[PDB]
Amino acid sequence: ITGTSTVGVGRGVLGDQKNINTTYSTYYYLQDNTRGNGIFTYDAKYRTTLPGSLWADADNQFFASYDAPAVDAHYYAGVTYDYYKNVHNRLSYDGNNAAIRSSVHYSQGYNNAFWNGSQMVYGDGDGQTFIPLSGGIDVVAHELTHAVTDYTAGLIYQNESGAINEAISDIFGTLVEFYANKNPDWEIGEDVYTPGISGDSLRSMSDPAKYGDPDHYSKRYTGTQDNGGVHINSGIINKAAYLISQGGTHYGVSVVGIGRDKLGKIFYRALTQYLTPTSNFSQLRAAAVQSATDLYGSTSQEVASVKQAFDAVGVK
Numbered sequence: 001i002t003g004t005s006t007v008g009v010g011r012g013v014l015g016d017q018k019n020i021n022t023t024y025s026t027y028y029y030l031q032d033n034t035r036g037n038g039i040f041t042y043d044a045k046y047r048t049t050l051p052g053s054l055w056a057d058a059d060n061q062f063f064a065s066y067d068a069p070a071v072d073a074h075y076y077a078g079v080t081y082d083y084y085k086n087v088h089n090r091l092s093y094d095g096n097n098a099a100i101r102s103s104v105h106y107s108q109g110y111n112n113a114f115w116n117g118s119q120m121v122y123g124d125g126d127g128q129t130f131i132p133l134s135g136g137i138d139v140v141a142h143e144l145t146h147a148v149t150d151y152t153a154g155l156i157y158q159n160e161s162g163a164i165n166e167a168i169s170d171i172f173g174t175l176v177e178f179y180a181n182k183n184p185d186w187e188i189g190e191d192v193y194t195p196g197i198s199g200d201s202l203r204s205m206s207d208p209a210k211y212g213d214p215d216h217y218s219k220r221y222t223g224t225q226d227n228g229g230v231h232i233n234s235g236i237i238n239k240a241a242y243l244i245s246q247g248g249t250h251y252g253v254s255v256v257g258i259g260r261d262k263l264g265k266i267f268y269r270a271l272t273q274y275l276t277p278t279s280n281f282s283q284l285r286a287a288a289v290q291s292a293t294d295l296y297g298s299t300s301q302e303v304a305s306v307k308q309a310f311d312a313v314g315v316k
């Protein structure tokens with residue numbers, strides 16, 4: 001809609017207060033004109049029709065419980081936009097400043113969030129397994145990174161390529177969580193998963209085996225569930241990414257950590273320059289080694305650490 005750019009205030013899913021960019025035209029709308037072609041947040045009104053109605057508010061204050069998922073969907077889309085622009089010089093998910101659209105209150109008791117090819121969709125959860133999923137910055141950034149992957153490498157969502165696709169989304173989801181300094185960790189979804197249970201998450205990048213996911217190629221899942229294990233076998237790549245950043249000794253292989261910024265630069269370059277739709281784990285290793293070589297030199301510590309990390313998880 002056309003109107004005046006304003007700044008409102010509200011509270012997110014976890015009760016935290018934050019400022020959000022709105023647009024004023026009789027009502028205040030969740031329309032952020034300051035980022036690319038805009039960030040737009042919609043109310044799906046517990047239906048499955050998309051996108052729903054552009055979110056309208058009478059007073060530019062978003063403190064009602066019904067508002068909370070919209071506040072966070074809107075705000076964390078903005079943070080994700082800022083991460084890709086300021087850190088990687090990428091303008092929105094398509095690199096051409098496409099508008100980011102999100103719908104909240106999708107369906108009823110819906111325990112999921114997804115990028116559907118043109119927009120973000122957030123369930124409210126059932127209040128036991130999940131609370132509204134836009135409350136997790138790593139979830140928001142994980143799903144938006146699927147859009148980045150679709151517009152670059154085109155990794156297919158099954159078998160090893162699909163596990164790489166998932167891991168890429170976990171890696172950048174976590175780097176956005178650190179970038180925002182929002183209670184950062186190497187877990188996925190901890191802020192919105194099982195509100196009754198402290199200290200758990202959907203999966204761990206630092207210790208995938210904590211939840212039974214593999215942390216070595218010899219332990220990879222080879223069945224047909226989960227599109228061939230895309231959310232299971234991602235643990236192998238997630239552990240490698242954790243080792244590249246933080247270092248450690250894993251199955252007897254010592255890895256010298258090089259930090260989060262260089263992890264992001266290496267994987268972003270691998271994704272945008274070298275990966276293809278059917279890349280497997282071995283080709284990811286080659287792409288990461290080449291990317292580190294491009295950026296830091298063939299004899300650099302950065303290249304050595306990438307090699308060490310993939311050796312540690314058994315990917316040659």
Ligand SMILES: O[C@@H]1[C@@H](O)[C@H](O)OC[C@H]1O
Pocket residue numbers: 087174175176178179260261264
């Ligand atoms: O913490 C990281 C920061 O150091 C780097 O600059 O960009 C990515 C962030 O995750």
Ligand SMILES: O[C@@H]1[C@@H](O)[C@H](O)OC[C@H]1O
Pocket residue numbers: 185186206207246
């Ligand atoms: O050392 C930390 C590890 O114990 C934790 O699991 O994830 C973050 C790491 O830096």
Ligand SMILES: O[C@@H]1[C@@H](O)[C@H](O)OC[C@H]1O
Pocket residue numbers: 209210211212213
């Ligand atoms: O030891 C772990 C166990 O606690 C969990 O239940 O399943 C996976 C194992 O790695």
Ligand SMILES: O[C@@H]1[C@@H](O)[C@H](O)OC[C@H]1O
Pocket residue numbers: 158159160220221222223227228229233
């Ligand atoms: O069955 C597949 C297996 O062969 C591969 O190594 O990793 C992904 C699985 O889906």
Ligand SMILES: O[C@@H]1[C@@H](O)[C@H](O)OC[C@H]1O
Pocket residue numbers: 216218251314
């Ligand atoms: O680290 C182990 C490696 O040494 C062996 O060769 O294959 C299985 C791995 O667990």
Ligand SMILES: [Ca+2]
Pocket residue numbers: 057058059060061062063
């Ligand atoms: Ca209001």
Ligand SMILES: [Ca+2]
Pocket residue numbers: 138174177184185186187188189190
């Ligand atoms: Ca997290």
Ligand SMILES: [Ca+2]
Pocket residue numbers: 190192193194195196197198199200201
């Ligand atoms: Ca929990």
Ligand SMILES: [Cl-]
Pocket residue numbers: 206207
């Ligand atoms: Cl560990």
Ligand SMILES: [Cl-]
Pocket residue numbers: 206207215250
């Ligand atoms: Cl471990």
Ligand SMILES: [Cl-]
Pocket residue numbers: 247248249250
């Ligand atoms: Cl470790």
Ligand SMILES: [Cl-]
Pocket residue numbers: 249250251252
């Ligand atoms: Cl270990």
Ligand SMILES: [Zn+2]
Pocket residue numbers: 113114115143
């Ligand atoms: Zn998803």
Ligand SMILES: [Zn+2]
Pocket residue numbers: 142143146165166169
């Ligand atoms: Zn995913």
Ligand SMILES: [Zn+2]
Pocket residue numbers: 177182183184185190191
């Ligand atoms: Zn966290």
Ligand SMILES: [Zn+2]
Pocket residue numbers: 202203211212213231232
């Ligand atoms: Zn798992």
